[PDB]
Subunit: 358 residues, 2 copies
């Protein structure tokens, strides 16, 4: 009872502290401070500020937040009269917060906390009115963060690991066939594939204009506009049933579709008989109430702030970010005629990755 | 190479912290919408019943409940043996923290510090690059409203019921009547409480932020005590008179922001009666900043980056920050200013240290 009250008060404080540390990590990533400290090595606040051209007093207070949190270590100085306090980012921590090239990189994701916190007033209203919150109302920082994080694990995983891991896929892509990306987002996946497999006709589908034009610009900057087309709209309606796609990708967006079953039917119509549907969705329990832990809590909070309101505003099914766990993916795929559902090693414990075939 | 187990462990801590951020945003939303108090008072409830009782939409309330049940803040008894629907419970031990402002354990309103200060991220990116401050007036009103909310809760629990009776001789001196001052009077609740309880006292608040000045005046007017409560806009170091007759001077969570803390303490010493009391609330960290450790220190340093330091710089202050006056520094500054008796009292939070200070 009293022990339980004090224990919970501690958990509450820990979570508020985690919120503040998340905001500090997002600031640090935007400012380049984690990469700066990793490359510099053990550093005082003055030397880290000088290296980045930033203000030492602010950098110092930021460092002290992170040394209190154990994200960096500190060797106190000699205020008697190694000089100043010296801070180090451990290599194991830099793999997570500093180096995009690390398969462990998550640093940019911390910006989801401030970017979605900005929508608190909008959700206070929406909880009352029952309306959705259109995608265009969210901060640009949200979509920039989504592109940043997608680019990092796509660069690490798509060509080095996923495509080679899937039987016969690389050979079919080299020969050339249609490739589709449902929810093409920032467009990096299609640029990677178009450069590596120039005989494929690549098409992205996205409902958000900002994403459509970003992906087009990315293709243009890479010189692959002749290989990469972007379509604005809902792939369930626009993905053609030509039975010839060697690959259809769908990362973190099927759960927002207005009619997931309809979307899978469209995927099944597009795929070649030996084509591959590569699906990334959240992990979690088949029964929502059985979910437990930090990953589920994080994802449900993001679901409240973005996935559910934005999908409602588009009149969608609003299943939310946790709305397609493995059992539901398997049931929906069986219904749609996608009979082979296999898990692949996931980029995060947050997600489940599937190789799906007709 | 990399130690994989330590990398995976740190990745876990990072995810735990992002989850804490999301849960904090959900708690702030829930407090604003009254969902915790509704769930506590109604008892075990489905999402539909809770939404209907609060005038809200079931789909949104459901996703909010699932966040909190995943986090273990509420418990859930699943339904569907076809108890039909899932039923959620806020344990009484948890309601004491997040639902009831009357509880001494209440912290629910504080969660709104996370979204309110997150909104200042873009401003701090610029400030890191230019060295400029960020004036207090740039912050969301929700920040100051949250400060008033949380101050009101522990002042109502502690000031008259616990602190004043604990301070030897103070109640009797206030009953007879003497000047009372509040450095950083904020929302004005402390001065209203004392003016109601001890009407022979002349109470004066000092605050540099106009929003606080006018709120404190309105609170006094609403309570019928304007005749006893004056609010002064500006810095108490310059404006607090040296009349040697104040029975009580209060300063809660703001001395560390002053441009010259020693000067501010010197002004307090001049105002106090010889048996007058300076009641000081400050943060409870290490004497050496780099020795700080743990979630409380991390939370406070993050708020210090986002608010305490930039807002004090914008006013040309010393910008010591939220952790800048730990006990060793309080005691050193007090000894220098002639405040010889420094005693700790039981603090409202683990975050803070509370002092009874006398000349």
């Amino acid at each position: 009872d009293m022990a339980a009250t004090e224990a919970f008060a501690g958990r509450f404080l820990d979570d508020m502290g985690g919120g503040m540390v998340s905001i500090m990590c997002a600031l640090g990533d935007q400012l380049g401070l984690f990469r700066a400290l990793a490359e510099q090595g053990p550093s005082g606040s003055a030397d880290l500020a000088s290296r980045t051209g930033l203000d030492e007093r602010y950098v110092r207070e930021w460092l002290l937040c992170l040394s209190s949190a154990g994200y960096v270590t500190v060797d106190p100085g000699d205020p008697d009269g190694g000089g100043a306090d010296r801070f180090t980012l451990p290599a194991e921590h830099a793999a997570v917060v500093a180096f995009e090239e690390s398969p462990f990189f998550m640093g940019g994701a911390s910006r989801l906390v401030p970017a979605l916190a900005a929508m608190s007033d909008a959700l206070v209203e929406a909880f009352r009115t029952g309306a959705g919150v259109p995608q265009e109302r969210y901060p640009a920082a949200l979509y920039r963060t989504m592109w940043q994080m997608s680019s990092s694990w796509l660069n690490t995983l798509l060509l080095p690991q996923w495509i080679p891991a899937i039987d016969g896929l690389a050979k079919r892509l080299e020969s050339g066939a249609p490739v589709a990306h449902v929810g093409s987002g920032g467009g990096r996946a299609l640029v990677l594939l178009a450069q590596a497999f120039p005989n494929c006709r690549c098409t992205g589908y996205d409902r958000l204009r900002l994403n459509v034009e970003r992906a087009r610009q990315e293709a243009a900057d890479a010189g692959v506009t002749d290989r990469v087309e972007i379509v604005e709209g809902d792939a369930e309606r626009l993905l053609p049933a030509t039975g010839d796609h060697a690959l259809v990708m769908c990362f973190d967006v099927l759960h927002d579709a207005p009619d997931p079953a309809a979307a899978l039917r469209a995927v099944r119509g597009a795929l070649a008989p030996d084509g591959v549907f590569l699906l990334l969705e959240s992990n979690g329990a088949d029964r929502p109430a059985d979910n437990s832990g930090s990953a589920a809590a994080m994802l449900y909070g993001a679901s409240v702030l973005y996935s559910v309101p934005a999908s409602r505003a588009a009149g969608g099914a609003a299943l939310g970010l946790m709305g397609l766990p493995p059992g539901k993916v398997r049931a929906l795929c069986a219904e749609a005629g996608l009979r082979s559902v296999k898990r692949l090693p996931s980029p995060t414990p947050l997600n489940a990755l599937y190789e799906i075939r007709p």
